[PDB]
Amino acid sequence: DSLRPKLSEEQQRIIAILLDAHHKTYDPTYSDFCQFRPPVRVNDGGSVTLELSQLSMLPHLADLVSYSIQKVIGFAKMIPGFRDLTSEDQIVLLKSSAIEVIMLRSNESFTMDDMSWTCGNQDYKYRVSDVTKAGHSLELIEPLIKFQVGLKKLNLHEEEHVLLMAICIVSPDRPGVQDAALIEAIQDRLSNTLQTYIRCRHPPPGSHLLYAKMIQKLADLRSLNEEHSKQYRCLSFQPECSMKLTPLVLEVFG
């Protein structure tokens, strides 16, 4: 039974637009990372106290996340439809989705060889231990790694990955959005592009369950977003934390 309509010419052009936007905003060589404040790994082999006392990886990771937010804002601008929104909604959407899109886009440096984000170059291989040296706890980190493994095992085509990031950004149910209807219209155009693509371009397919899986990842990201927000708020109570962050990070997560 299941029909397999072909991608319209407009859908194909959406896909091409989104691949080009990603290629313009995600350097797969990580060649800017040497410009960030450097990573420092104090031995905390075991401690929340040590660690909040040092936050040795926070300057480097905050610069990394700050840089990623900028690339994401650049990616968003190229999403077909996004600029038809009011700038107030554009920013609501970017601010509420930023950490989720960072978590998604980070899947490209994530490796199941050793369960790290390998952006280098050894200095820029990030593990669970680095995330705890930036003041976060296992209640964020463990489900983050689960999410990364789950996403990897979907073996998404790049077309799927960039569509999934766009759909994440353009979510009509973010708090504070005004024109939810327009946002939903933009998102549906993207979601239809993704369903059609999966059905006509993705083999075998007994992965017609792929679309529901991807949608579930969006749900998972929502939970990670609330847990992140909870921890960031506590982290920010550390005296002089702000010096280790950036103005853009302060604004987005504050």
Ligand SMILES: C[C@H](CCCC(C)(C)O)[C@H]1CC[C@H]2/C(=C\C=C3C[C@@H](O)C[C@H](O)C3)CCC[C@]12C
């Ligand atoms: C939870 C943490 C962000 C915490 C930021 C803070 C401000 C301290 O709350 C995660 C989110 C994404 C994670 C990682 C890498 C992300 C990227 C981003 C992407 O834009 C390029 C590359 O893929 C590395 C591994 C370290 C741990 C990172 C930074």
